[PDB]
Amino acid sequence: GSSGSSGTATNHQGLPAVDSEILEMPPEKADGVVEGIDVNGPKAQLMLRYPDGKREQITLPEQAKLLALVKHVQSKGYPNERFELLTNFPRRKLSHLDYDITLQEAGLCPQETVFVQESGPSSG
């Protein structure tokens, strides 16, 4: 038979610190241009697909400047400078090309799937 044990210790300290709660009245805004008035003819159906997991389909003109679609996703909650718009196939990053072009040039006609992706530091 056998047995035994023991132990001990002690301590005590503390000190107050600072902190911040109230913010310095942060800014806030949300608004842009205004488009509409559809035109007579074939429209390009674009399927906006957000990364969050949600999606949204819209209809724009084939003559509509890519920017138009870009602005859409822009007002939706995705700045180009930040996020980049892609297609279904072939994989095309709606940007390099240009915006002054047409939904067609960008290659989003007639119907194409526009996916929203996160862009690095300015393109990359």
Method: NMR
Give the C-alpha distances (Å, rounded to integers) separating 26 from 5, 32, 76: 60, 20, 21
Backbone angles phi, psi at 85, to 5 degrees: -95, 135
> Is residue 60 within 8 Å of residue 46, measured between CB atoms?
yes
Structure tokens at 16: 């107050």
> Is residue 109 within 8 Å of residue 62, measured between CB atoms?
yes
Three-state secondary-structure class, residue 93: strand
Residue 68 Ramachandran class (φ > 0 left, ψ -120 to 50 alpha, else beta): alpha
Which ranges in the chain belong to alpha helices (H)?
Answer: 66-77
Assign 3-state DSSP to the chain and report helix, strand, coil percentages, each to 5: 10, 20, 70
